[PDB]
């Protein structure tokens, strides 16, 4: 059982719209720190909301009595910023949060100390060629590198060390972490880079994918998100067409190249943002099924379901406007997309207790053997024009 350690109202800084919003936060003893539109009455807790292993800053700009939770989540540094009315309030909160976090590190260390089983056994920047900037965030950059000794290509995420201070995933369509090392002032993650090209480029050249082509890519995405949701208890919150690449054989790869940009331009890409993220509401696994819907609409229709060059009007489209479909789209596709793009997460396909299973049973995916998807036994509809892992057809 997870009991409430401290609860109350905070002003949460907004990333997309209203900048400062009052929210009712519960800090629980499992480490979750979650804000709601209103104080709630009564799913599985998401690690996205954990304060475990966070660092806590007090600050006075741009508002007095603000404080910051900074966490490293897998390979991404994220910052949550809050404001209270009195400095005494801020000390109650930072102290409660630290106490919950410390108690979590404590019981954890005692448990692994007790269970270590002759796992008590005791790479540098020079080893790599910089090739090309892939992204810059507030606390790091992501670069395409060539590992000198092997000639292989990787993305390297380079983080500022002082904002932070074997666990990989067995899913074939996620970005695997190859090495992790540190320098005197940096933490570097070396992760795989697919050389079958960017799906945004493939879609742009083909104009549209057939429903069957989109079915193949969507299935692989569904299987990766299911894995994240139910094995890792994390939501991705970053699904967009540009974060999908193909490997040398035509199988999907979801990239892990994102960096938060708060404090350097939105963080993500606005046209893929789910309504509950825009409004800074309580969100859960269902934000990813919204992202799946935007990506598959784009795949099957050749364009976005919501677009406007003015991001203020795009947000309004995302929040208010009902979705329209090209006249050629079939009804199973339409059923899938409008279920994925329900504005209310509570109504959204995948937004119920069953999560991915709701999508895997949708008649648009009928006939898919989900075990063969996970084992890469489905035959790719498109084989990219590379015949080696070190082939640079799709960068040069």
């Amino acid at each position, epitope marked *: 059982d997870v009991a409430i350690v401290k609860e109350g109202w905070l002003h949460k800084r907004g990333k997309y719209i209203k900048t400062w919003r009052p929210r009712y936060f519960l800090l629980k003893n499992d480490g979750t720190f979650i804000g709601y539109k209103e104080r709630p009455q009564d799913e599985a807790p998401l690690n996205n909301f954990s304060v475990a292993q966070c660092q806590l800053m007090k600050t006075e700009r741009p508002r007095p009595n603000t404080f910051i939770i900074r966490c490293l989540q897998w390979t991404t540094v994220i910052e949550r910023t809050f404001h209270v009315e009195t400095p005494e309030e801020r000390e109650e909160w930072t102290t409660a949060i630290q106490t919950v976090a410390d108690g979590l590190k404590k019981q954890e260390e*005692e448990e692994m*100390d007790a269970s270590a089983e002759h796992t*008590d056994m*005791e790479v540098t920047m020079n080893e790599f060629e910089y090739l090309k900037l892939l992204g810059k965030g507030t606390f790091g950059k992501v670069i395409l590198v060539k590992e000198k000794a092997t000639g292989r290509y990787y993305a390297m995420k380079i983080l500022k060390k002082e904002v932070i201070v074997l666990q990989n995933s067995r899913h074939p369509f996620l970005t695997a972490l190859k090495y992790s090392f540190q320098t005197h002032d940096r933490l570097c993650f070396v992760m795989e880079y697919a050389n079958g090209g960017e799906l945004f480029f493939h879609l742009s050249r083909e104009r549209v994918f057939s429903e069957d082509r989109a079915r193949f890519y969507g299935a692989e995405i569904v299987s990766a998100l299911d894995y994240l949701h139910s094995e890792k208890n994390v939501v991705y919150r970053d699904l967009k067409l540009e974060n999908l690449m193909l490997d040398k054989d035509g199988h999907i790869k979801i990239t892990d190249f994102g960096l938060c940009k708060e404090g350097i331009t939105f963080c993500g890409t606005p046209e893929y943002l789910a309504p509950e993220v825009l409004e800074d509401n309580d969100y859960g696994r269902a934000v990813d099924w919204w992202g799946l819907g935007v990506v598959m609409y784009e795949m099957m229709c050749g364009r976005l379901p919501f677009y406007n060059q003015d991001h203020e009007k795009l947000f309004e489209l995302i929040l208010m406007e009902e979705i329209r479909f090209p006249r050629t789209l079939g009804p199973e596709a339409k059923s899938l997309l409008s279920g994925l793009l329900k504005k209310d997460p509570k109504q959204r396909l995948g937004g119920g207790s069953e999560d991915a299973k709701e999508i895997m049973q949708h008649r648009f995916f009928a006939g898919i053997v989900w075990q063969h998807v996970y084992e890469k036994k489905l035959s790719p509809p498109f084989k990219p024009q590379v015949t080696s892992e070190t082939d640079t057809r799709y960068f040069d």
Partner: nanobody
Amino acid sequence: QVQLQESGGGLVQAGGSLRLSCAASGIDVRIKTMAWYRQAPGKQRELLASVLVSGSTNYADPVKGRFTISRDNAKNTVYLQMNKLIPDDTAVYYCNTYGRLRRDVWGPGTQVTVSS
């Protein structure tokens, strides 16, 4: 404070024996896998021996049959009995917990020197 302290090192002739002890204050050795390590003037630090909470022991090869690791719950201390010493054993010796090991926290260590 919160720390491990090694003692029992010194100069000793080849084939001889030495008993190293690691005294824990602020740490309970009953609750933690314990291990002994050593590091020589130019080389990597070497896992030597570990004892789980169950009492089961394990040894790296160049030491098996000559050293024995033991933990005495009463005096909150681990031991490393070192027998039939070879000058290839000359090093500074450290005991540690898993948690401290991953954080690279080390006690002062004790120097063992064997030559003849």
